[PDB]
Design a protein around this ligand. Structure first.
Ligand SMILES: CC[C@@H]1[C@@H]2NN=CN2c2cnc(Nc3ccc(C(=O)NC4CC4)cc3OC)nc2N1C1CCCC1
Length: 281
């Protein structure tokens, strides 16, 4: 159907892109200009409580001015008594979670190709004093040009000193850093850890601390108990080992990650073919 603001400007809702607690996403085209967006439709009732209202407002607040080629462009939002409509950059090639579901694994140059873009995106965020806090495949949006845009600022936060930062446990369990599980909160090092998990998932097929239970995963994270498949290259295993460190201060910075042999000695394609979304390039 149609969506509209205070100006009466209409937008045609296309296909449902996805759901997940608690927003429905659609492709939305402006009726008068044809401008396409990825619209997050949030029911007002699901964000009526203060904590849920604050989460939604923070996402909008932090996402608003973010201008980087490796960051989803926030377009605009508006709201009525029923919904909150968040208009975001539509990325025609879905997400790395969609590609991962189709592929299971990516080849080393592909992982390197996406990791560079993710790191470029994250660096921009970190330089702006914003922590993503929810780095996962599901949050890396792919355009028609096979350009990765880091998205979903639903858990984004202002980077705060250790003593000041909220000590809340949040973020996708398979990607969450041990200091977060230890109620020390998220620092830039927690985003770096999530990237180590991203890298591992893309190379091996599954998150490194994935188990049957959440409790067991949390124990595996805290003890940094995971297996490095023998088939991954030495620079890939070296980088995964440097990144997946229990102590946040022992982890490399984004600049250090990018100066590691995995990136410096490895082949990075200038572009990946569209076909790589569903099958080996
Ligand atoms: C709009 C919400 C987020 C997002 N946040 N920031 C940018 N975002 C997105 C940008 N582009 C897209 N693209 C798409 C995602 C899934 C599909 C897809 O076909 N989904 C099939 C299961 C029905 C198609 C997309 O574009 C044609 N999704 C976004 N997503 C997806 C998250 C899950 C649903 C949409």
């Amino acid at each position: 159907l149609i969506t509209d603001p205070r100006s009466g400007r209409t937008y045609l809702k296309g296909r449902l892109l996805g759901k997940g607690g608690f927003a429905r996403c659609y492709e939305a085209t402006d009726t008068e200009t044809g401008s396409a967006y990825a619209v997050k439709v949030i029911p007002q009732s699901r964000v009526a409580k203060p904590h849920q209202r604050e989460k939604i407002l923070n996402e909008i607040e932090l996402h608003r001015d973010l201008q980087h080629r490796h960051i989803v462009r926030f377009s605009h939002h508006f709201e009525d008594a029923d919904n909150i409509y968040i208009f975001l950059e539509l990325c025609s090639r879905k997400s790395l979670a969609h590609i991962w579901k189709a592929r299971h694994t990516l080849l080393e140059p592909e992982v390197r190709y996406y990791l560079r873009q993710i790191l470029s995106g994250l660096k921009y965020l970190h330089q702006r004093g914003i922590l993503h806090r929810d780095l996962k495949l599901g949050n890396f949006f792919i355009t028609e040009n096979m350009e990765l845009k880091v998205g979903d600022f639903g858990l984004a936060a202002r980077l705060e000193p250790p003593e000041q930062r909220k000590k809340t446990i949040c973020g996708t369990p398979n990607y969450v850093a041990p200091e977060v599980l230890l109620r020390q909160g998220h620092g830039p090092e927690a985003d770096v850890w999530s990237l180590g998990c991203v890298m591992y998932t893309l190379l091996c097929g599954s998150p490194p601390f994935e188990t049957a239970d959440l409790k067991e995963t949390y124990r595996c994270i805290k003890q940094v108990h995971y297996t490095l498949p023998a088939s991954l290259s030495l620079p890939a295993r070296q980088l995964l080992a440097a990144i997946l460190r229990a102590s946040p201060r022992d982890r490399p910075s984004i600049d250090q990650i990018l100066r590691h042999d995995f990136f410096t000695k490895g082949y990075t394609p200038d572009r990946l073919p569209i076909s790589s979304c569903v099958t080996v390039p």
